[PDB]
Design a protein around this ligand. Structure first.
Ligand SMILES: [Mg+2]
Lengths: 73, 39, 140, 97, 25, 148, 94, 156, 59, 108
């Protein structure tokens, strides 16, 4: 389990990380499900383009927003 | 406690992610923008 | 003897300069002064977390006493303050409760109103008003 | 002068006399002392609060261990409020016109 | 170390006791 | 430790931020040896950057005694009268420059314990709290367990 | 009055530790999180038979880069400038 | 639905009702208008603020002193404008609220004076019967700041 | 307030008496409040080295 | 009407909200003490030291307030007057007095 955790890139606690959705990573996550938390990743808009790289955010509940600002609605 | 803020979308730690961390702290008096920190 | 020790007294003074305010033979006996200074430095280094915890508990106790004197409690006050989109740590709250009672009473009134609005929304399962002082601000 | 008290630089003797003189200069009758709050009257550590009332209206209040020092503190507070040199005054503007 | 079957009931582990207490009827 | 060394309070020397800011550093007496391998950094400093350091702030006077010694030292006096003497024995030019910059930026206060990093002169604004606060007054201030 | 035998945590007659409410709530929330993880880990995408070799090129390139970085170990270069400017220790007012 | 008045029928807390929302909004508008009038007419003095600078919430008032634990990459004698205002108010009125206040509401002006490090602290480790003993001296840089005056604009 | 220094300190740090009536009252709830007011857990200027103890008179 | 806190002690707070939705404004004016909640200050004018034969006899009697005791009863009287413990009225050793900071720093 320690080896799987170290190979999945989860050294520090409370650190987000994105993997694929294939049976291999599925089994690797089922091995350490009692140690980590599995949550899907959804996209409200489109994928970040080349110009929308330095302006991005992960947000809560897994919502990779493409346009993140510091101004209220 | 910070579990109530998990349902609104502002995470649970106010010292990170939001208008209190990404916003520049200090600035000049004439109007020049302060250089962002390395963090 | 060849190139022996000729500056041992300076090391003794450097060690004893940290043991100039102790009781007993610890301020004169080097063999015991070494251990005394070692333990003193170790405790002074390890007591930082203890000092932080003591200050935090003192701030919490002051906030609780102020809330009990005004007419509320501590957990309800903390919840209503964290549910009103206002980020104030315990230090500024204690400083206000000690020096500025008007703003602390205003905060207590706002907390009581927020608690009443939350209770009303829970009993009504809200639908339409959901609290006047509520309405979280969306930052995109 | 930042943070210093007014009468510490003035050092008066009878605050009540100057207070009643200023009140007579402001078309005011005469102030009278009333005991607002108190705690411990027979112990070695007493506390009193004397409030100066002018025409059934409070103007200031001053604490003290006895009644004389409390009335003196109340008169000092009233005289400092009538002169506009209090702790809630406007700070000095250290800028250029 | 004791065996798997004994007469003195033998108190279970802390995690096993927590699991049996949280999964009651 | 704090129980073995004296402490002080955090305050200004003569309120520099209120009115106008003045330079706390006054004189800088440098002692660079003529010959030796222990004052090369000080020699290179006096050769290349002492003119720029003197022209940066006109309120600081630099004295170069040039006394043949073995340990190069520097004397820094401030407005309050404190004299902090440090040695630049075997140091590079950048280290000496950073040291003199830190000496010019600081004042004459002691480098002991800070003791409460925040200091205010008017702490009470809306009235300092007293035990009689948040307590309503009864009719005529009648104490409990009385008849009149 | 009541005495505990040798070590209240190991051995035969031990001091029994019980469960309160905080531990029960923690176990409940952890079981809920684990059930949510089980639900989110119950749907693949490529069904194994559609990934015979999609990202093997990147792995091969990374392995070649690691091999090139590990096989390029050599002592650093040695210049005369250091040996020449080391003579400046006894520098005078020149 | 009718229940007799006993010991456990009615809740111990008094039943609290809520007023009309329209009347409440009207009262709030009247109060904020009175506050704006009192601000524009000049009836305040000696105000304080809670500036969140360097992740430390201070009681920034008129003529005060603060100390941080780092540097600001600025020369001694430059004015610093502080933002992130979450609470402000002189006497008889205070302003709050949602994360921050507006940038045109509160204008805090600070000034750097002294730039000194700190006292030589001691960090020592030790273990029993293991010949383990470590010791260091950490001298972190600090920066002394001083807030001049705090202005307020009546643009509510 | 506009108070000085010694009168302000005497008004801040001062002993305040209290009256706690009994008659059909549990001793635990009364003793809890009595000890809270004796230690100083009802004032914001609470401190162990300040010696801000008050007086509680339980009848 | 509705009030979150009783507006009869300390201060009178009035909660409000800005129509914009980004700030909270509260107006709390100061509250004074009415005239019907105060009592007249007593004036203890005690005078029982003057007579008809002499006039400075009262001035002579004014110098008759002196009483001497040892240590036990004195500490007991101090403890019963100040409501303290008798352990604090005893002297201290010189080792606990030479290390006393006679000139401590002062703030404000
Ligand atoms: Mg045993």
């Amino acid at each position: 389990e320690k080896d799987i955790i170290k190979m999945l890139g989860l050294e520090k606690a409370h650190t987000p990380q994105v993997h694929k959705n294939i049976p291999s990573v599925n089994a690797k996550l089922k091995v350490v499900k009692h140690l980590i938390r599995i949550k899907p990743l959804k996209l409200p808009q489109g994928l970040p383009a080349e110009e929308n790289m330095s302006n991005t955010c992960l947000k809560s509940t897994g919502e990779l927003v493409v346009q993140w600002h510091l101004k209220p609605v | 406690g910070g579990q109530w803020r998990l349902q609104q979308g502002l995470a649970a730690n106010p010292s990170g992610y939001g208008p209190l961390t990404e916003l520049p702290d200090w600035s000049y008096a004439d109007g020049r923008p302060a250089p962002p920190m390395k963090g | 003897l060849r190139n022996r020790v000729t500056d041992r007294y300076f090391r003794i003074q450097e060690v004893l300069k940290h043991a100039r305010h102790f009781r007993g033979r610890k301020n004169r006996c080097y063999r015991l002064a070494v251990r005394t200074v070692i333990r003193a430095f170790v405790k002074c280094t390890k007591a930082r977390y203890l000092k932080k915890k003591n200050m935090r508990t003192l701030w919490i106790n002051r906030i609780t006493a102020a809330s009990q004197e005004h007419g509320l409690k501590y957990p309800a006050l903390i919840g209503n303050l964290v549910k009103c989109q206002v980020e104030l740590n315990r230090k500024v709250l204690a400083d206000l409760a000690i020096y500025e009672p008007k703003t602390f009473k205003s905060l207590a009134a706002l907390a009581s109103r927020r608690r009443h609005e939350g209770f009303a929304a829970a009993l009504g399962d809200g639908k339409e008003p959901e609290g006047i002082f509520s309405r979280v601000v969306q930052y995109h | 002068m930042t943070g210093k008290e007014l009468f510490e630089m003035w050092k008066i003797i009878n605050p009540m006399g100057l207070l009643v003189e200023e009140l007579k200069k402001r078309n005011v009758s005469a102030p009278e002392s009333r005991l607002t709050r108190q705690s411990g009257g027979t112990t070695a550590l007493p506390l009193y609060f004397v409030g100066l009332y002018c025409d059934k209206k409070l103007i200031a209040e001053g604490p003290g261990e006895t009644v004389l020092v409390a009335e003196e503190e109340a008169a000092r507070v009233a005289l400092r409020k009538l002169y506009g040199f209090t702790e809630n005054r406007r700070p000095w503007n250290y800028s250029k016109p | 170390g004791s065996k798997a079957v004994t007469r003195h009931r033998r108190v279970m582990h802390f995690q096993r006791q927590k699991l049996m207490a949280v999964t009651e009827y | 430790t704090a129980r073995g060394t004296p402490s002080r309070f955090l305050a200004s020397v003569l309120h520099n931020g209120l009115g106008r800011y003045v330079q706390q550093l006054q004189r800088l007496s440098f002692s660079v040896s003529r010959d030796g391998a222990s004052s090369r950094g000080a020699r290179e400093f006096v050769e290349r950057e002492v003119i720029d350091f003197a022209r940066r702030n006109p309120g600081v006077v630099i004295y170069v005694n040039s006394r043949p010694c073995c340990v190069p030292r520097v004397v820094a006096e401030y407005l309050n009268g404190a004299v902090r003497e440090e040695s630049i024995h075997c140091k590079s030019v950048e280290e000496i420059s950073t040291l003199v910059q830190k000496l010019a930026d600081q004042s004459g206060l002691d480098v002991i314990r800070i003791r409460k990093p925040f200091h205010t002169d008017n702490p009470s604004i809306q009235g300092q709290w007293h035990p009689f606060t948040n307590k309503p007054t009864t009719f005529r201030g009648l104490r409990p367990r009385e008849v009149q | 009055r009541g005495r505990i035998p040798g070590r209240q945590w190991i051995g035969k007659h031990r001091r029994p530790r019980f469960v309160s409410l905080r531990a029960k709530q923690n176990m409940i929330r952890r079981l809920e999180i684990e059930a949510e993880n089980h639900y989110w880990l119950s749907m693949p995408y490529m069904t194994r038979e559609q990934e015979r070799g999609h990202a093997a090129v990147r792995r091969r390139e990374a392995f070649e880069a690691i091999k090139a970085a590990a096989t390029s170990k050599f002592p650093p270069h040695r210049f005369i400038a250091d040996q020449l400017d080391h003579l400046n220790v006894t520098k005078k007012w020149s | 639905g009718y229940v007799p008045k006993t010991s456990l029928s009615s809740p111990p807390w008094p039943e609290v009702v809520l007023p009309d929302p329209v009347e409440e909004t009207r009262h709030h508008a009247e109060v904020v208008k009175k506050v704006n009038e009192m601000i524009v007419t000049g009836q305040y003095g000696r105000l304080f603020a809670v500036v969140h600078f360097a992740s430390r919430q201070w009681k920034v008032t008129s003529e005060d002193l603060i100390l941080i634990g780092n540097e600001l990459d600025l020369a001694c004698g430059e004015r610093i404008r502080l933002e992130k205002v979450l609470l402000v108010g002189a006497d008889n009125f205070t302003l709050l609220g949602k994360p921050l206040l507006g940038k045109d509401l509160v204008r805090v002006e600070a000034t750097v004076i002294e730039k000194t490090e700190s006292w030589p602290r001691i960090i020592m480790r030790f273990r029993k019967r293991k010949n383990f003993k470590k010791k260091r001296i950490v001298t972190t840089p600090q920066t002394v700041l001083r807030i001049n005056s705090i202005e307020i604009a009546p643009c509510l | 307030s506009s108070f000085s220094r010694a009168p302000q300190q005497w008004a801040t740090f001062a002993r305040i008496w209290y009256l706690l009536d009994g008659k059909m009252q549990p001793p635990g709830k009364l003793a809890a409040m009595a000890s809270i007011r004796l230690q100083g857990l009802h004032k914001p200027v609470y401190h162990a080295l300040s010696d801000c103890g008050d007086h509680v008179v339980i009848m | 009407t509705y009030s979150p806190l009783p507006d009869d002690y300390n201060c009178n707070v009035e909660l409000a909200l800005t129509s914009d939705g980004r700030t909270i404004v509260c107006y709390h004016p100061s509250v004074d003490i009415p005239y019907e909640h105060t009592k007249p200050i007593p004036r203890p004018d005690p005078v029982h030291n003057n007579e008809e034969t002499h006039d400075q006899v009262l001035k002579t009697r004014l110098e008759e307030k002196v009483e001497h005791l040892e240590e036990g009863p004195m500490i007991e009287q101090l403890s019963k007057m100040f409501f303290t413990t008798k352990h604090r009225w005893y002297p201290h050793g010189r080792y606990h007095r030479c290390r006393k900071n006679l000139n401590p720093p002062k703030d404000r």
